[PDB]
């Protein structure tokens, strides 16, 4: 049997990867950045509380204008919230109430939805009739839909729990490109600002870098010890942060292909649902299962601040494009805006 | 101190809040039931009885009571990443046939489908999201089980079992074995039933068990039970 041979060759290549990463590691981010000034304590009060939902909120996304946001909960409805005047722009009833992901378009025209039903439904917000209607159904995937993120107006990248990630075409409705590298259920998806590459974090404790146009996996990151639930790109686009169930946020570089540092604390033992970056990138915000949000410092590996507003598990966390505020949702049906 | 459009927008938000309250009241009056059957099971039958690709849902009203039917048999993924979505359900129906003790899965010859069903039931009962959620146990294919007992002994699946090859004693032993996996004996109740060909009887049992669970939940919320 030459399958064993193949196994040996794969092990040798993994040894080559770890040897190259160890050889390239001349220093660490902690000893480089220990000379700069500390961030200090950061206290954010609750500017606004959005209270329209009646069930547990799973996902949220910010608009390009950083005023309109989209919220999804188990009542079977997507709610478009106005941040400044706490108003409800739209209430979209879902065909399937088992929603686990929602996305707002960069143009502002469409709202993506998905969940335990295998469909990232696209809703048109700018109809002539004045109501919000389903654009089409996207039924290619078999597993539960984990994350939709509008790549563009006509193209939408998505991840599901059938171990694959697909890039769809809005007009045609067919599965334009399918990425099958992962060996575990994919949970988190994040897009780069230059809109060419994207990172997918799965339950095989590895984060994979993918190319949009070409279609193959560039790099893999195997630092985590457990299911990676959240992933988010650094604003530069050369790094990304991952949050998993082992109470550890890990920052990975695309160019260096290694984990610079790990953000963990002894008191924290719970899993990480959602991680986001600030506009500068100095602050890493991470939700937690123990009813809490930790504003870690992305360079000093220190806790800049704590946000303890919510009464239940924080499942979604987003930061505006201008970096003005951070919206956090949870399972008590409340969205809080902090700045 | 706000614009005319701003006012109109606030009025629109109030109307949306109304619609949301009305829809929440409409959703709250329905009783939710999840279904869980390891491998081959009576799911295909039970759903048909209730009526008279992802998650499938059917709506039906029995004795002026609206039932939400949730089935997860098409989800071939890790369950722990989405089982937390079913925290707020009222009942969980675990469907397990009795004719699977001799039959084995087509992945491993040594293990039995009954032990796999016991493992899944243990996992669901000891799950942290289902501490307050009641479980209704359904036992399927009584007649083919009786034929198998007349043809084959029960000791092939339980070596520690010692008793006569009689349907009543074997069914009692299987029911006791399933109900002994409930580690939380106080906060959880198991409603064991033997499913039959008559559609009305199974739905009636569901209605009675659901009625009891609703009464217990309301009393626990009040603090009396």
């Amino acid at each position: 049997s030459e399958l064993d041979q193949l196994r040996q060759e794969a092990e040798q290549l993994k040894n080559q990867i770890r040897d190259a990463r160890k050889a390239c590691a001349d220093a660490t981010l902690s000893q480089i950045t220990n000379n700069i000034d500390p961030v200090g304590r950061i206290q954010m009060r609750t500017r606004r509380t959005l209270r329209g939902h009646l069930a547990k909120i799973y996902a949220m996304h910010w608009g390009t204008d950083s005023r309109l946001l989209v919220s999804a909960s188990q009542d079977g409805k997507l709610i478009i919230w106005d941040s400044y005047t706490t108003n409800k722009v739209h209430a979209i009833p879902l065909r399937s109430s088992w929603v686990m992901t929602c996305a707002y378009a960069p143009s502002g025209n469409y709202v993506a939805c998905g969940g335990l039903d295998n469909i990232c439904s696209i809703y048109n917000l700018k109809t002539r009739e004045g109501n919000v209607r389903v654009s089409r159904e996207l039924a290619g995937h078999t597993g539960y839909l984990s994350c939709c993120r509008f790549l563009d107006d006509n193209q939408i990248v998505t991840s599901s729990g059938d171990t694959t990630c697909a890039l769809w075409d809005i007009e045609t409705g067919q599965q334009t490109t399918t990425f099958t590298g992962h060996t575990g259920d994919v949970m988190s998806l994040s897009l780069a600002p230059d809109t060419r590459l994207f990172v997918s974090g799965a339950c095989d404790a590895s984060a994979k870098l993918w190319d949009v146009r070409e279609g193959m996996c560039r790099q893999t990151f195997t630092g985590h010890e457990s299911d990676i639930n959240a992933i988010c790109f650094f604003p530069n686009g050369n790094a990304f942060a991952t949050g998993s169930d082992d109470a550890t946020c890990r920052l990975f570089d695309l160019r260096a292909d290694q984990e610079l540092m790990t953000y963990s604390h002894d008191n924290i033992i719970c899993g990480i649902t959602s991680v986001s970056f600030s506009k500068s990138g100095r602050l890493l915000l991470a939700g937690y299962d123990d009813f809490n949000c930790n504003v870690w410092d992305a360079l000093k590996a220190d806790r800049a601040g704590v946000l303890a507003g919510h009464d239940n598990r924080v499942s979604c966390l987003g930061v505006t494009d201008d970096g003005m505020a951070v919206a956090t949702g949870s399972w008590d049906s409340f969205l809080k805006i902090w700045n | 101190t706000l614009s005319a459009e701003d006012k109109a927008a606030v009025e629109r938000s109030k109307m949306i809040d109304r619609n949301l309250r009305e829809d929440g009241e409409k959703a709250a009056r329905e009783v939710k039931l999840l279904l869980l059957g390891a491998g081959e099971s009576g799911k295909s039958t039970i759903v048909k009885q209730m009526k008279i690709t992802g998650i499938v849902e059917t709506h039906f009203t029995f004795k002026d009571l609206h039932f939400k039917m949730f089935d997860v048999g098409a989800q071939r993924s890790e369950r722990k990443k989405w089982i937390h979505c079913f925290e707020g359900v009222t009942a969980i129906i675990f469907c397990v046939a009795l004719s699977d003790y001799d039959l084995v899965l087509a992945e491993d010859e040594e293990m039995n489908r009954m032990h796999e069903s016991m493992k899944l039931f243990d996992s669901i009962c000891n799950n942290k999201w289902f501490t307050d959620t009641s479980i209704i146990l359904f036992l399927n294919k009584k007649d083919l089980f009786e034929e198998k007992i007349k043809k084959s002994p029960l000791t092939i699946c339980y070596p520690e079992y010692a008793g006569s090859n009689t349907y009543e004693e074997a069914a009692a032993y299987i029911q006791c074995q399933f109900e002994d996996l409930n580690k939380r004996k106080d906060t959880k109740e198991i409603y064991t039933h033997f499913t039959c060909s008559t559609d009305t009887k199974n739905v009636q049992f569901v209605f009675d068990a659901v009625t009891d669970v609703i009464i217990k939940n309301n009393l626990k919320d009040c603090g009396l039970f």
Partner: single-chain antibody, 232 residues
Framework: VQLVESGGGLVQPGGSRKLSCSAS????????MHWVRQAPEKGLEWVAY????????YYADTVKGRFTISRDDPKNTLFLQMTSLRSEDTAMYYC??????????????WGQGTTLTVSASADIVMTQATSSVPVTPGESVSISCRSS???????????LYWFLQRPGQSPQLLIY???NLASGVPDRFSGSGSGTAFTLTISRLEAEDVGVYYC????????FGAGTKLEL
């Protein structure tokens, strides 16, 4: 999206008449509705407004307590009951649909209107410099209007609307909130202003742009301009 209304014709003075409008092709329950009056020689004059939830019913000062506006959402019909008509109401009536939310385009669609003929202060006014200008095709023309009060509210939105009424056709919304273009409006129309003086500019004018331009405010309750007629 269609609005067909009826109930016009000859009305004796002091009588009562009901104008009935039927809306098809869009969601009628979620839209606020307006009634706008246009004299044969004068400009558009606002008459009434009803919201989506049949609340915040607003009237003009000249018709307050004399006209009652109501709607029926399952039948998708808007009715205006007019009582004690004088000789100042012998004018075309237009049904306008407006939805109000962040980024919306209210006053987007106008009805065809019904002729009704009767047999024989403390409001924001709009000032127009000139009423008729000669324009040639392919040229750029700017039309300026003034407001008695600064329309820049504290939330950063200036409430000015521009309407085009071609001869023999209903008014069409061109620019809303003095900057944003409406759906179906070509990109050569543009608007600018500071709070009092407002300018609409047309570059590379086409023969289909010949009509009357009306400016409206929407800060408080709604007044139109006199209208600028464009001639070849």
């Amino acid at each position: 999206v269609q609005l067909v209304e009826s109930g016009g014709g000859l009305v004796q003075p002091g009588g009562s008449r009901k104008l009935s409008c039927s809306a098809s092709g869009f969601a009628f329950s979620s839209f606020g509705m307006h009634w706008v009056r246009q004299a044969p020689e004068k400009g558009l004059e606002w008459v009434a407004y009803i919201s989506s939830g049949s609340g915040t019913i607003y009237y003009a000062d000249t018709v307050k307590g004399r006209f009652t506006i109501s709607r029926d959402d399952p039948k998708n019909t808007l009715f205006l009951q007019m009582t004690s008509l004088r000789s100042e109401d012998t004018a075309m009536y237009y049904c306008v649909r407006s939805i109000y939310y962040y980024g919306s385009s209210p006053f987007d669609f106008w009805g065809q209107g019904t002729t009704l003929t009767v047999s024989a202060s403390a409001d924001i006014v709009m000032t127009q410099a000139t009423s008729s200008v000669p324009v040639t095709p392919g040229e750029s023309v700017s039309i300026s209007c003034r407001s008695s009060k600064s329309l820049l509210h504290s939330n950063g939105n200036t409430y000015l609307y521009w309407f085009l009424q071609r001869p023999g056709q209903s008014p069409q919304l061109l620019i809303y909130r003095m900057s944003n273009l409406a759906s179906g409006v070509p990109d050569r129309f543009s608007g600018s202003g500071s709070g009092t003086a407002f300018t609409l500019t047309i570059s590379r004018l086409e023969a289909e742009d010949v009509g009357v331009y009306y400016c409206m405010q929407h800060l408080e309750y709604l007044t139109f301009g006199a209208g600028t007629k464009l001639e070849l």
